[PDB]
Amino acid sequence: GDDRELAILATAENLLEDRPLADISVDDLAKGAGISRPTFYFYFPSKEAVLLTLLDRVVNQADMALQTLAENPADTDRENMWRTGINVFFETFGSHKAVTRAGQAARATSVEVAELWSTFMQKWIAYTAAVIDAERDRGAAPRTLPAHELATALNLMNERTLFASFAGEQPSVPEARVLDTLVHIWVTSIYGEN
Amino acid sequence: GDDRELAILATAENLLEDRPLADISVDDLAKGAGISRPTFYFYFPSKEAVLLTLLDRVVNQADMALQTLAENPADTDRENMWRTGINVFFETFGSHKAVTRAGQAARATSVEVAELWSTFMQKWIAYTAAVIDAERDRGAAPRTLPAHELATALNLMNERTLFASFAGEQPSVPEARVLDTLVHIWVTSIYGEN
């Protein structure tokens, strides 16, 4: 039941490391999970549904880690504050590269995946803008661009840049340089008078 | 011949405004171009080949405009220099939204389109890094991040941000705000000591 469903999810995540979702059959998933094909269909309507659940788990894990960070005070310089925040996403998605990659690809073909990604991007943009606004209210950051517009561009940069790095795309920032790269761009753009 | 090929390309660009390439038949393209289906196949092997040519034309048009800008001196403040450069791409791709949209989608399914996009991104990143390097050599910009890494993140931000704006994605920066938004992030990140 719960353990049969988890075994399907774990199998799917494992197989996605080696091949595209298109190259993975419902048969592969059932076999990996130690169940029959008809039993698989009790837990999931399709392999696409399995990917959606995997993506949902990872995105919620990132979101929850951001929430935990946000709850703490927690005495730090402004650059370190943003670095710790971006790190939540670097570590969470970077620890689930196969799911990250497959989930991004599915945005083109699945309305559910597209909606899921959109929902969480809006949430993360809103939180970013709220923190920028707080920084401005404090006198710590200058009142330059509309905070929400600035937040949107910075979050879209993170999406494209982190994911190109994880996929080893040509061009991409090396994974070992991408955190410092994004942090510099966030800090200078949020705190820079010009 | 040359005019038959141009009519196919123009027809394809027109139909892409209204529907996905998948919703456009070779029949539609031939009919729009005033030719038969077998005659279409003389000029192009597939509708995918038509999209590749459309994308190639637009990307080269942007690249050539950047070259022209780069040839001039041409007495300006640093913010305006970068604004004029980003504007080349905003105007070129923004004047061909349907081709831009379809070309980006085809990156997932066409190695030729993927390679084309990669080639020009590497070129634009290299040019960006060269200009940053020149600015540093001048004493105009500080020696912060590796120029090529900074250039890569800024160009990936432009790709994701411009194209989300043109597509009206949720989330996206409004098209009427995206130029100012990207310029601020470029200027602060290139010239900001922190």
Ligand SMILES: O=C(Cc1ccccc1)N1CCC(c2nc(-c3cccs3)no2)CC1
């Ligand atoms: O990188 C992201 C989100 C993202 C990750 C991957 C792909 C697209 C978007 N963020 C969103 C939230 C942003 C943020 N951090 C914080 C805080 C950090 C520390 C205390 S609050 N507030 O907003 C950090 C960077």
Ligand SMILES: O=C(Cc1ccccc1)N1CCC(c2nc(-c3cccs3)no2)CC1
């Ligand atoms: O926006 C882009 C490229 C791009 C556009 C869309 C999608 C992805 C990438 N660029 C690349 C070149 C960059 C640049 N401008 C210049 C100069 C401007 C004026 C004189 S040189 N040098 O590099 C401007 C911004």
